[PDB]
């Protein structure tokens, strides 16, 4: 009789999502731009470090 | 224990990087 606990959990899930505070368009844009800036910074810094270190890795090994 | 600062960590990180680089270069020199 595990159908009832699962149904109760599902009902709680939709209830919570209904009373969750979804991001707005301005908030979503702010978070998206911040994540894009962070991703660009870290990913491109690592990419340039790897690109620089490829020739030295070839030279030493 | 050995309560040290940030510069004694940055310097040691660069020293370890230089040490492994010198190890590789010395290996290259001694292989030939």
């Amino acid at each position: 009789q595990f159908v009832e606990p699962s149904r109760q959990f599902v009902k709680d899930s939709i209830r919570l999502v209904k009373r969750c505070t979804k991001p707005d368009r301005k908030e979503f844009q702010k978070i998206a731009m911040a994540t894009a800036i962070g991703f660009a910074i870290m990913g491109f810094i690592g990419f340039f470090v790897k690109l620089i270190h490829i020739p030295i890795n070839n030279i030493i090994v | 224990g050995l309560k040290v600062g940030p510069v004694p960590v940055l310097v040691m990180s660069l020293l370890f990087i230089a040490s492994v680089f010198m190890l590789h270069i010395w290996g290259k020199y001694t292989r030939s």
């Binding site: 959990f9 709680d12 899930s13 209830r15 919570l16 999502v17 009373r19 969750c20 505070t21 979804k22 991001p23 908030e27 979503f28 978070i31 998206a32 911040a34 994540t35 962070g38 991703f39 870290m42 990913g43 491109f44 810094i45 690592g46 990419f47 470090v49 790897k50 690109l51 270190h53 890795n57 030493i60 090994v61 | 224990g1 050995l2 309560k3 040290v4 600062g5 940030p6 960590v9 940055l10 040691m12 990180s13 660069l14 370890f16 990087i17 492994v20 680089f21 190890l23 590789h24 290996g27």
Partner: protein, 458 residues
Amino acid sequence: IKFLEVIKPFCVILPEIQKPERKIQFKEKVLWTAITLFIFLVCCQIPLFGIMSSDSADPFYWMRVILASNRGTLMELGISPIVTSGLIMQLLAGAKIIEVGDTPKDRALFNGAQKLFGMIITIGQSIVYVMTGMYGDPSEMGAGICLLITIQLFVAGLIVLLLDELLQKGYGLGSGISLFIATNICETIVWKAFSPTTVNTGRGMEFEGAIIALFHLLATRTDKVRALREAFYRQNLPNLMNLIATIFVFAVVIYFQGFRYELPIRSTKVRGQIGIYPIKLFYTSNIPIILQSALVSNLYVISQMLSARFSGNLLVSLLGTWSRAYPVGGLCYYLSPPESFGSVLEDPVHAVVYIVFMLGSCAFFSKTWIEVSGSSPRDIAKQFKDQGMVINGKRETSIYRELKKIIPTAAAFGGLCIGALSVLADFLGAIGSGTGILLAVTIIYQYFEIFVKEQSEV
């Protein structure tokens, strides 16, 4: 506290970072974070010295991108020892084996035992890497070369511990481990889009970076639609639809990251401090994903080692059969994402089992970590009582009930959502994988929260 006391003589031998005495300015914190990130990124490209052969199969390839690892380099162990030590310390504290304590002496002992366990795990993992066929045959390399490699990995792990501690103590923006994971994942995603590496298999020179490959194909075939479809639908190399799926997954996890329940809280001791207590839908930020990925990778490695040492046994066949080796049957096959949509159609039972396992494991890890990490509704009610905070609409007595009606459901549904996001990213073929993209976006959200906190305070 007895367990910490007996190991205190061993815990007072490893160095620790100086506590800052003036509050560190945001610019100085950014400078320190950048310096530590540059040190880690330089270390993760420098190879070891004693490696004799890096041609053998790699058994830990799976979660290398999220372990901040890179095979054959100084950062080969990555974050594994630090995360393992943190996990075991949290398990000991939550399950009431040791006491973290509200005393600086107790905190010092806790943070010394954590680093001691991290160093022990570093040594053990280095020995395992050496002795399980990596670097070449250990007998051929020799005891001296094995010891030299172990010392190099030992010092690299010490450096990672020192940089992580430097970032934690107040010199940096956040935590070293999260920064390293997110940086490695973002670096992998950027590399699979803008790399200059060229591989030729008969058709000609073709960059394996997706966008550079698109530009090169446009230049070579003069804007031909065949070149466009080769750039988008490239199976053998990273393509552009994988990038589109990656961006879509980032957008969706960003949308679901801002989901939160806003509890209107009033302070009764310091009257007038009305505020809001947010219960994020992603209650346990990425702990369920980390736990599930670690469990699955450990199961894969154990299955490979058992099928190697104990080939022919029925039990190891039930635990998983292999054929980079990929699972074909057994327990480990059902824990692996389906290869493609055709694989889903051929074996719908496997896809259903994989989805069910992902969602259930994520939910279980979330609802267990809320009880082990001290974020259970009872603990939140206890800190509410300690700090005098009360919910506006509800009575002071009905504070634990309101948290019990939200926090367990929030944790469980956050587990389902964060497992479904990983499953969707895996199905869509997104560069970085479900785990990598989820970890990266959650860590960047944490750093964005740090930014909007410190800038607002400034």
